[PDB]
CSV table of N, CA and C in Angstrom, one decimal:
chain,number,residue,atom,x,y,z
A,1,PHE,N,24.2,48.3,1.2
A,1,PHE,CA,24.9,47.1,1.7
A,1,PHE,C,25.0,46.1,0.6
A,2,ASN,N,26.2,45.5,0.5
A,2,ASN,CA,26.5,44.4,-0.4
A,2,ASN,C,26.6,43.1,0.4
A,3,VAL,N,25.8,42.1,0.1
A,3,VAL,CA,25.8,40.8,0.9
A,3,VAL,C,26.2,39.7,-0.1
A,4,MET,N,27.3,39.0,0.2
A,4,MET,CA,27.7,37.9,-0.7
A,4,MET,C,27.7,36.6,0.1
A,5,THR,N,26.8,35.7,-0.3
A,5,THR,CA,26.6,34.5,0.4
A,5,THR,C,27.1,33.4,-0.6
A,6,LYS,N,27.8,32.4,0.0
A,6,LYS,CA,28.3,31.2,-0.8
A,6,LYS,C,27.9,30.0,0.0
A,7,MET,N,26.7,29.5,-0.2
A,7,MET,CA,26.2,28.3,0.5
A,7,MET,C,27.2,27.1,0.3
A,8,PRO,N,27.4,26.3,1.4
A,8,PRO,CA,28.2,25.1,1.2
A,8,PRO,C,27.7,24.2,0.1
A,9,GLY,N,28.7,23.7,-0.7
A,9,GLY,CA,28.3,22.8,-1.8
A,9,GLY,C,29.4,22.8,-2.8
A,10,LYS,N,29.1,22.9,-4.1
A,10,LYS,CA,30.1,23.0,-5.2
A,10,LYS,C,30.8,24.3,-5.2
A,11,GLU,N,30.2,25.4,-4.6
A,11,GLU,CA,30.8,26.7,-4.7
A,11,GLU,C,31.8,27.0,-3.6
A,12,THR,N,32.0,26.1,-2.7
A,12,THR,CA,33.0,26.3,-1.7
A,12,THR,C,34.2,25.3,-1.7
A,13,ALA,N,34.2,24.4,-2.7
A,13,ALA,CA,35.2,23.4,-2.8
A,13,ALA,C,36.5,24.0,-3.3
A,14,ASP,N,37.6,23.5,-2.8
A,14,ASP,CA,39.0,24.0,-3.3
A,14,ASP,C,40.0,22.9,-2.9
A,15,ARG,N,41.2,23.1,-3.3
A,15,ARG,CA,42.3,22.2,-2.9
A,15,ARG,C,42.5,22.2,-1.4
A,16,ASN,N,42.1,23.2,-0.7
A,16,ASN,CA,42.2,23.3,0.7
A,16,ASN,C,41.0,22.6,1.4
A,17,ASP,N,39.8,22.7,0.9
A,17,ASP,CA,38.7,22.0,1.4
A,17,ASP,C,38.0,21.3,0.2
A,18,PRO,N,38.5,20.1,-0.1
A,18,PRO,CA,37.9,19.3,-1.2
A,18,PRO,C,36.5,18.9,-1.0
A,19,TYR,N,36.0,18.8,0.2
A,19,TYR,CA,34.7,18.3,0.4
A,19,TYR,C,33.6,19.4,0.4
A,20,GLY,N,34.0,20.6,0.6
A,20,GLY,CA,33.1,21.7,0.4
A,20,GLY,C,32.0,21.8,1.5
A,21,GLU,N,32.4,22.1,2.7
A,21,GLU,CA,31.5,22.1,3.9
A,21,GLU,C,31.2,23.5,4.5
A,22,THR,N,32.2,24.4,4.4
A,22,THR,CA,32.1,25.7,5.1
A,22,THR,C,31.7,26.7,4.1
A,23,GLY,N,30.6,27.5,4.4
A,23,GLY,CA,30.2,28.6,3.7
A,23,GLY,C,30.4,29.9,4.5
A,24,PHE,N,29.9,31.0,4.0
A,24,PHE,CA,30.0,32.3,4.7
A,24,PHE,C,28.9,33.2,4.2
A,25,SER,N,29.0,34.4,4.8
A,25,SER,CA,28.1,35.5,4.4
A,25,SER,C,28.7,36.9,4.8
A,26,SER,N,29.1,37.7,3.9
A,26,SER,CA,29.9,38.9,4.2
A,26,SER,C,29.0,40.1,3.7
A,27,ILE,N,29.0,41.1,4.6
A,27,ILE,CA,28.2,42.4,4.3
A,27,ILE,C,29.2,43.5,4.3
A,28,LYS,N,29.5,44.1,3.2
A,28,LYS,CA,30.4,45.3,3.1
A,28,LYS,C,29.7,46.5,2.6
A,29,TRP,N,30.2,47.7,3.1
A,29,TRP,CA,29.5,49.0,2.8
A,29,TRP,C,30.4,50.2,2.9
A,30,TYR,N,30.1,51.2,2.2
A,30,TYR,CA,30.8,52.5,2.2
A,30,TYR,C,30.1,53.5,3.0
A,31,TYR,N,30.8,54.4,3.6
A,31,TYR,CA,30.2,55.5,4.4
A,31,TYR,C,31.1,56.7,4.4
A,32,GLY,N,30.6,57.9,4.4
A,32,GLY,CA,31.3,59.1,4.4
A,32,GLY,C,30.5,60.2,4.9
A,33,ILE,N,31.1,61.4,5.1
A,33,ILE,CA,30.4,62.6,5.6
A,33,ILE,C,31.1,63.8,5.0
A,34,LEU,N,30.3,64.9,4.9
A,34,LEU,CA,30.8,66.2,4.4
A,34,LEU,C,30.2,67.3,5.2
A,35,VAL,N,30.9,67.7,6.3
A,35,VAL,CA,30.4,68.7,7.2
A,35,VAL,C,30.6,70.1,6.5
A,36,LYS,N,29.6,70.7,6.1
A,36,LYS,CA,29.6,71.9,5.3
A,36,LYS,C,29.6,73.2,6.2
A,37,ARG,N,28.8,73.2,7.2
A,37,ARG,CA,28.7,74.3,8.1
A,37,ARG,C,28.8,73.7,9.6
A,38,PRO,N,30.1,73.4,10.0
A,38,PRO,CA,30.3,73.0,11.4
A,38,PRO,C,29.9,74.0,12.4
A,39,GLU,N,29.6,75.3,12.0
A,39,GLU,CA,29.1,76.3,12.8
A,39,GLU,C,27.7,76.0,13.4
A,40,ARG,N,27.0,75.1,12.7
A,40,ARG,CA,25.6,74.7,13.1
A,40,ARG,C,25.5,73.5,14.0
A,41,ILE,N,26.5,72.6,14.0
A,41,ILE,CA,26.6,71.5,14.9
A,41,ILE,C,27.1,72.0,16.2
A,42,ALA,N,26.4,71.8,17.3
A,42,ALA,CA,26.8,72.2,18.6
A,42,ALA,C,26.7,71.1,19.6
A,43,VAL,N,27.7,70.9,20.4
A,43,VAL,CA,27.8,69.8,21.4
A,43,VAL,C,27.9,70.4,22.8
A,44,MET,N,27.6,69.6,23.8
A,44,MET,CA,27.7,70.1,25.2
A,44,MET,C,28.0,68.9,26.1
A,45,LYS,N,29.1,69.0,26.8
A,45,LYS,CA,29.6,67.8,27.6
A,45,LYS,C,29.4,68.1,29.1
A,46,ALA,N,28.9,67.1,29.8
A,46,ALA,CA,28.7,67.1,31.2
A,46,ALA,C,28.6,65.7,31.7
A,47,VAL,N,28.9,65.6,33.0
A,47,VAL,CA,28.7,64.2,33.7
A,47,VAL,C,27.3,64.0,33.9
A,48,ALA,N,27.0,62.7,34.2
A,48,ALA,CA,25.6,62.2,34.5
A,48,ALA,C,25.6,61.5,35.8
A,49,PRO,N,24.4,61.5,36.5
A,49,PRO,CA,24.3,60.8,37.7
A,49,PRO,C,24.2,59.3,37.5
A,50,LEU,N,24.5,58.5,38.6
A,50,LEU,CA,24.5,57.0,38.5
A,50,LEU,C,23.2,56.5,38.1
B,24,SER,N,5.1,-23.5,41.9
B,24,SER,CA,5.1,-22.6,43.0
B,24,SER,C,5.0,-21.1,42.6
B,25,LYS,N,4.8,-20.8,41.3
B,25,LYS,CA,4.6,-19.5,40.8
B,25,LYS,C,3.4,-19.3,39.9
B,26,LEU,N,2.5,-20.3,39.9
B,26,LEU,CA,1.2,-20.2,39.2
B,26,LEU,C,0.4,-19.1,39.7
B,27,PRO,N,-0.4,-18.4,38.9
B,27,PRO,CA,-1.3,-17.3,39.4
B,27,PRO,C,-2.6,-17.9,39.9
B,28,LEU,N,-2.5,-18.8,40.9
B,28,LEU,CA,-3.6,-19.4,41.5
B,28,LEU,C,-4.4,-18.3,42.3
B,29,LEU,N,-5.8,-18.4,42.2
B,29,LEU,CA,-6.7,-17.5,42.9
B,29,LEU,C,-7.7,-18.3,43.7
B,30,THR,N,-8.1,-17.6,44.8
B,30,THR,CA,-9.1,-18.2,45.7
B,30,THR,C,-10.5,-17.6,45.5
B,31,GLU,N,-11.5,-18.3,46.1
B,31,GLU,CA,-12.8,-17.8,46.0
B,31,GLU,C,-13.0,-16.4,46.6
B,32,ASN,N,-12.2,-16.0,47.6
B,32,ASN,CA,-12.3,-14.8,48.2
B,32,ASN,C,-11.7,-13.6,47.4
B,33,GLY,N,-11.0,-13.9,46.3
B,33,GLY,CA,-10.4,-12.9,45.5
B,33,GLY,C,-9.2,-12.2,46.3
B,34,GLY,N,-9.2,-10.9,46.2
B,34,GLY,CA,-8.2,-10.1,47.0
B,34,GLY,C,-7.1,-9.6,46.1
B,35,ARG,N,-6.2,-8.8,46.7
B,35,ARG,CA,-5.1,-8.3,46.0
B,35,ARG,C,-4.0,-9.4,45.9
B,36,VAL,N,-4.2,-10.3,45.0
B,36,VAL,CA,-3.2,-11.4,44.8
B,36,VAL,C,-2.9,-11.6,43.3
B,37,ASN,N,-1.6,-11.7,42.9
B,37,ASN,CA,-1.2,-11.9,41.5
B,37,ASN,C,-1.1,-10.6,40.8
B,38,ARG,N,-0.2,-9.7,41.2
B,38,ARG,CA,0.1,-8.5,40.5
B,38,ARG,C,1.4,-8.7,39.6
B,39,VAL,N,1.3,-8.2,38.4
B,39,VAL,CA,2.4,-8.3,37.5
B,39,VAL,C,3.0,-7.0,37.0
B,40,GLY,N,4.1,-7.0,36.4
B,40,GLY,CA,4.7,-5.8,35.9
B,40,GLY,C,5.1,-5.9,34.4
B,41,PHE,N,5.7,-4.8,33.9
B,41,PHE,CA,6.0,-4.7,32.5
B,41,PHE,C,7.3,-3.9,32.3
B,42,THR,N,7.8,-3.8,31.1
B,42,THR,CA,9.0,-3.1,30.8
B,42,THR,C,9.1,-2.9,29.3
B,43,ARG,N,9.7,-1.7,28.9
B,43,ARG,CA,10.0,-1.4,27.5
B,43,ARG,C,11.5,-1.1,27.4
B,44,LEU,N,12.2,-1.9,26.7
B,44,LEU,CA,13.6,-1.5,26.3
B,44,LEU,C,13.6,-0.6,25.1
B,45,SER,N,14.8,0.0,24.9
B,45,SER,CA,15.0,0.9,23.8
B,45,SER,C,16.3,0.6,23.0
B,46,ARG,N,16.3,0.8,21.7
B,46,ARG,CA,17.4,0.7,20.9
B,46,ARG,C,18.0,2.0,20.6
B,47,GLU,N,19.1,2.1,19.8
B,47,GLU,CA,19.7,3.3,19.4
B,47,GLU,C,20.6,3.1,18.2
B,48,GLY,N,20.6,4.2,17.4
B,48,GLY,CA,21.5,4.2,16.2
B,48,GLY,C,22.2,5.5,16.0
B,49,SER,N,23.1,5.6,15.1
B,49,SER,CA,23.9,6.8,14.9
B,49,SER,C,24.4,6.9,13.4
B,50,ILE,N,24.5,8.1,12.9
B,50,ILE,CA,24.9,8.4,11.6
B,50,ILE,C,26.4,8.9,11.7
B,51,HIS,N,27.3,8.3,10.9
B,51,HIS,CA,28.7,8.7,10.9
B,51,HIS,C,29.0,9.3,9.5
B,52,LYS,N,30.2,9.7,9.3
B,52,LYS,CA,30.6,10.3,8.1
B,52,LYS,C,32.0,9.7,7.6
B,53,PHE,N,32.2,9.6,6.3
B,53,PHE,CA,33.4,9.1,5.7
B,53,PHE,C,33.7,9.9,4.5
B,54,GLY,N,34.9,9.8,4.0
B,54,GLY,CA,35.3,10.5,2.8
B,54,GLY,C,36.8,10.6,2.5
B,55,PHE,N,37.2,10.4,1.3
B,55,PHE,CA,38.6,10.6,0.9
B,55,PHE,C,38.7,11.4,-0.4
B,56,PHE,N,39.9,11.8,-0.8
B,56,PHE,CA,40.0,12.6,-2.0
B,56,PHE,C,41.4,12.3,-2.6
B,57,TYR,N,41.7,12.9,-3.8
B,57,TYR,CA,43.0,12.8,-4.4
B,57,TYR,C,43.1,13.9,-5.4
B,58,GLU,N,44.3,14.5,-5.5
B,58,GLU,CA,44.6,15.6,-6.4
B,58,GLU,C,45.3,15.1,-7.6
B,59,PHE,N,45.4,16.0,-8.6
B,59,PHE,CA,46.0,15.7,-9.9
B,59,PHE,C,46.2,17.0,-10.7
B,60,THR,N,47.4,17.1,-11.3
B,60,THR,CA,47.7,18.2,-12.2
B,60,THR,C,47.3,18.0,-13.6
B,61,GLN,N,47.2,19.0,-14.4
B,61,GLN,CA,46.8,18.9,-15.8
B,61,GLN,C,47.9,18.3,-16.7
B,62,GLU,N,49.2,18.6,-16.3
B,62,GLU,CA,50.3,18.1,-17.0
B,62,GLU,C,50.5,16.6,-16.7
B,63,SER,N,49.8,16.0,-15.8
B,63,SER,CA,49.8,14.6,-15.6
B,63,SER,C,48.7,13.9,-16.2
B,64,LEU,N,47.7,14.6,-16.9
B,64,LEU,CA,46.6,14.0,-17.6
B,64,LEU,C,46.7,14.2,-19.1
B,65,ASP,N,47.3,15.3,-19.6
B,65,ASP,CA,47.4,15.6,-21.0
B,65,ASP,C,48.7,15.0,-21.6
B,66,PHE,N,49.8,15.1,-20.9
B,66,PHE,CA,51.1,14.7,-21.4
B,66,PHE,C,51.5,13.4,-20.9
B,67,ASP,N,50.6,12.4,-20.6
B,67,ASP,CA,50.9,11.1,-20.1
B,67,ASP,C,50.8,10.1,-21.2
B,68,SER,N,51.0,8.8,-20.8
B,68,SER,CA,51.0,7.7,-21.8
B,68,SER,C,49.7,7.0,-22.0
B,69,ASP,N,48.8,7.1,-21.0
B,69,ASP,CA,47.5,6.5,-21.1
B,69,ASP,C,46.4,7.7,-21.1
B,70,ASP,N,45.6,7.7,-22.2
B,70,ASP,CA,44.6,8.7,-22.3
B,70,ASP,C,43.5,8.5,-21.3
B,71,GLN,N,43.3,7.3,-20.8
B,71,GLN,CA,42.2,7.0,-19.8
B,71,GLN,C,42.7,6.9,-18.4
B,72,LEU,N,43.7,7.7,-18.0
B,72,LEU,CA,44.2,7.7,-16.6
B,72,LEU,C,43.1,8.1,-15.7
B,73,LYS,N,42.4,9.2,-16.0
B,73,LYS,CA,41.4,9.8,-15.1
B,73,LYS,C,40.2,8.8,-14.9
């Protein structure tokens, strides 16, 4: 996980928000899969009671 | 006619009350700003404009 925080202050000022009040915190990540032997994964579907 | 006169027999006579008032304050916010380009500060007639 990559977490990028920019606390309100000098690091959030811009010509759009000259006072610098709003910050944020963003978490971005990569994920993938490589099914090599799908013959070994087995599923089974059925309904369930209330 | 309102003195706290008391008799020799005493008794439940001359009961008083009290009160506390309360004040209140509040914090407000203020602020202004102003923009400026670089070509209005380097290529101008007064070096001390800023």
